[PDB]
Design a protein around this ligand. Sequence first.
Ligand SMILES: [Ca+2]
Length: 223
Amino acid sequence: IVGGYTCGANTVPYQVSLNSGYHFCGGSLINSQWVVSAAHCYKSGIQVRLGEDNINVVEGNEQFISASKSIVHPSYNSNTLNNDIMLIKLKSAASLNSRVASISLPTSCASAGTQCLISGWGNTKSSGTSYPDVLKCLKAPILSDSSCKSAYPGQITSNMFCAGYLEGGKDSCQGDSGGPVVCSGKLQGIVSWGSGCAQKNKPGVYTKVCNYVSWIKQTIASN
Ligand SMILES: [Ca+2]
């Protein structure tokens, strides 16, 4: 996250880190047994790490749980990043507590101008490389679909939305992929792609979760 702030430990309790020997993607806990992330985060041998703040220090509220099953969206297209969403099932149920909490699926889509919370452990500089070890947070609004389509002609689908600031300076970035975008207490977005980070007239692009709730609910009940 570029231009954000330190969230505070476990102030974002649905936040997970996907770990394959190292942190490589964010994710969101949606119930005690299931995590949602980005399809581009797909890999084998994933361990899900819950209750994290500093991802390099064991602080006492962590739960480390291997994934039993991963399900990439059936229509995920790696070239265009359409349908950039995946479900991960935990080998054993997480223990929910103040520090580890699930986030609610939306009942409707969010409107442009709605304020959202984006979080993650990704790079914090737009120019350089600097990875934080504590969770960073950014408040950002959903942009109008026409600002979004203007920035990225021919690349935005109905399953994507843009959020951030056209002036640049504040954005998600490398290492934040798969993480949550929470607006009005509901998961509305997944960190998906962008061009650079925090560059002018290049806002972040997010998977539009409100389009997938039926698929999510049907898939978790069948697996
Ligand atoms: Ca830790």
